[PDB]
């Protein structure tokens, strides 16, 4: 048995945009889900080739927008809580149920050592070159954490990890 990730799509999201945002092959999407080439079925759980099952992952990331913090829960038990930075785009999602699609290791630039690609380019998590910008709200930036925090997270959590971006209010 090969337990893979399952993403739920809606009606309006362009297939090309989905493949691009997910950084995956468009052909692979049609490979796992041959119905996509015909039409976008809203409410259907599509299979993402290369992504593991998000329930098998014994790590739950509970993001709190109003508290600007990331609650890392191991086996449904809170293990650590680190301060994070969120943008106006993060306040949009009330539930924010997203999964990690891939993780970039050492981009060379001021990305913060590591880059965690989520199911949305503006809802992704990464470090930074200025830790003073962490813990507060930013204009239109993505989820930012400390250099050590993202390193710790990338070591504890794998791929497909369920990040729940809750506003808290």
């Amino acid at each position: 048995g090969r337990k893979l990730l399952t993403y739920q799509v809606k009606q309006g999201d362009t297939l090309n945009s989905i493949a691009a945002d997910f950084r995956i092959s468009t052909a692979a999407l049609l490979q796992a889900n041959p119905s996509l080439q015909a039409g976008l079925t809203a409410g259907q759980s599509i299979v993402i080739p290369g992504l593991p099952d998000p329930y098998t992952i014994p790590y739950h990331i509970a993001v709190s927008i109003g508290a600007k913090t990331l609650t890392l829960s191991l086996n449904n038990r809170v293990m650590k809580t680190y301060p994070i930075a969120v943008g106006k785009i993060l306040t949009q999602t009330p539930t924010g149920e997203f999964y990690i699609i891939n993780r970039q290791r050492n981009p060379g630039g001021p990305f913060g050592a590591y880059w965690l690609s989520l199911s949305k380019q503006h809802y992704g998590i990464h470090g930074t070159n200025n830790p003073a910008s962490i813990g507060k709200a930013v204009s239109k930036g993505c989820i930012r954490m400390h250099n050590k925090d993202v390193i710790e997270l990338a070591s504890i959590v794998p791929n497909g990890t369920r990040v729940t971006i809750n506003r808290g209010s």
Partner: peptide
Amino acid sequence: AXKX
């Protein structure tokens, strides 16, 4: 959306 986007990225960094």
